[PDB]
Amino acid sequence: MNPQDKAKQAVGYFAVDTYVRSGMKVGLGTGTTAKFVVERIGQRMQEGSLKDLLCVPTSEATRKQAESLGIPLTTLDGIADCLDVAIDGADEILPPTLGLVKGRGGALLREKMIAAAAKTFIVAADETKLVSNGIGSTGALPVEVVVFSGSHTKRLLSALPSVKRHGGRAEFRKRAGAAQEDIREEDRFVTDNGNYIVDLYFTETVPDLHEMDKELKSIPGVVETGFFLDLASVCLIGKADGSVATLTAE
Ligand SMILES: [Cl-]
Ligand SMILES: [Cl-]
């Protein structure tokens, strides 16, 4: 595998080895890094060191992967207390507050529901996910939006003061497939919750995340944002050489 994937693998395995134990209720992320987390839980099960485990997937792609490996699955409805731990990746990680940008794989809503329901929310990422001064340098800030009047909601997002200030441009997430100021409905990515996703790109770095998050949320039709603020408790960062750095809040 390439250097980036050895890093994603090392950090996923590490997360599972260090924080997951038998009898826990575990949240499972979505994406190429979470793939290795799921894969490691599957291995420890078969090896006999992980039992009586209840897991909650953040996407239908994640359940399908965990299903194919015999990992027990449910939703937050079937959990009485809180998840002990939730493990997921991130698209951007802003130390030292550990504010994140998530949602580039389309699963922001449930990832946030699962993260908020966990006593400890753990992010596992490779080194390229770390940013400085603010967000928006590696890509888009996703915003989940309802289907009805989606284009109009996209335009509203574009016009928010914080978004104009940072030179924001809006665009719909495309489904995997072929590809005027908007794309056609059949080409728009639909989340597991039946919603579209509006991606915001900026020409400059956005340093005030809390301010922007409130503005994005002031628009009716916005279901959820890619900002994960004051949620990550721990952020694991892996390198190709297999080592891992641990960032902790408080
Ligand atoms: Cl995602
Ligand atoms: Cl578009």
Domain ranges of the chain: 2-127+218-239, 128-217
| Method by which the coordinates were obtained | X-ray
Which tokens in the block code for residue 122?
Answer: 């753990």
Within this chain, domains 2-127+218-239 and 128-217 share the same CATH topology: no
Alpha-carbon gap, residue 234 to 100, rounded angstroms:
12
> Which fold, 128-217?
Alpha-Beta Plaits (3.30.70)
Q: What is the DSSP string of 140-157?
A: -EEEEE-STTHHHHHHHH
Q: Are 26 and 54 in contact (CB under 8 A)?
A: yes
Q: Which three-class secondary structure state does DSSP give residue 214? A: helix
The resolution in angstroms reads: 2.6
Give me ligand 1 centre to Cα 232, in Å: 15
Sign for the pseudo-dihedral over CA of 40, 225, 168, 207:
negative
| Closest C-alpha to 198, from 160, 157, 148 | 157
Residue 110, C-beta contacts closer than 8 angstroms, at least 6 positions apart: 57, 58, 59, 192, 193
Q: Which residue has the tokens 């130390």?
A: 95
Alpha-carbon gap, residue 228 to 143, rounded angstroms:
12
> Phi, psi (5° rounding) for residue 240?
-55, -35
Binding region: 8, 32-33, 129
Give me ligand 2 centre to Cα 164, in Å: 17
The environment of the single-atom ion ligand 1, i.e. residues with CB closer than 5 A, is 30, 103, 105, 107
Q: Are 226 and 110 in contact (CB under 8 A)?
A: no
Residue 226, C-beta contacts closer than 8 angstroms, at least 6 positions apart: 91, 101, 102, 103, 104, 108, 140, 141, 142, 143
Where does residue 133 rank: exposed (0-12), middle (13-18), buried (19+ CB within 10 A)?
Answer: exposed
> Phi, psi (5° rounding) for residue 115?
-65, -45
Q: Are 196 and 172 in contact (CB under 8 A)?
A: yes
Alpha-carbon gap, residue 37 to 16, rounded angstroms:
6
Give me ligand 2 centre to Cα 110, in Å: 23
CATH of domain 2-127+218-239: 3.40.50.1360
Alpha-carbon gap, residue 122 to 53, rounded angstroms:
17
Give me ligand 2 centre to Cα 220, in Å: 19
Q: Which ligand is nearest to the CA of 187?
A: 2
139-163 in b/e form (b: 16+ CB < 10 A) is ebbbbbbeeeebbebbebbbebebb
Binding region for (R)-malate: 8, 32-33, 129
Give the residue numbers marked as catalytic: 111
Give me ligand 1 centre to Cα 79, in Å: 23
Q: Are 92 and 138 in contact (CB under 8 A)?
A: yes
Q: Which residue has the tokens 């994140």?
A: 100
Q: Which ligand is nearest to the CA of 104?
A: 1
Angle between helices 3-19 and 32-46 (to 10 degrees): 50
Q: Are 126 and 8 in contact (CB under 8 A)?
A: yes
Where does residue 70 rank: exposed (0-12), middle (13-18), buried (19+ CB within 10 A)?
Answer: exposed
Report CA-CA distances (Å) from 205 to 92, 94, 103, 167, 193: 12, 12, 18, 9, 30
Count of positions (residues) in the chain: 250
Report CA-CA distances (Å) from 201 to 6, 30, 134, 158: 29, 22, 13, 10
Q: Are 41 and 71 in contact (CB under 8 A)?
A: yes
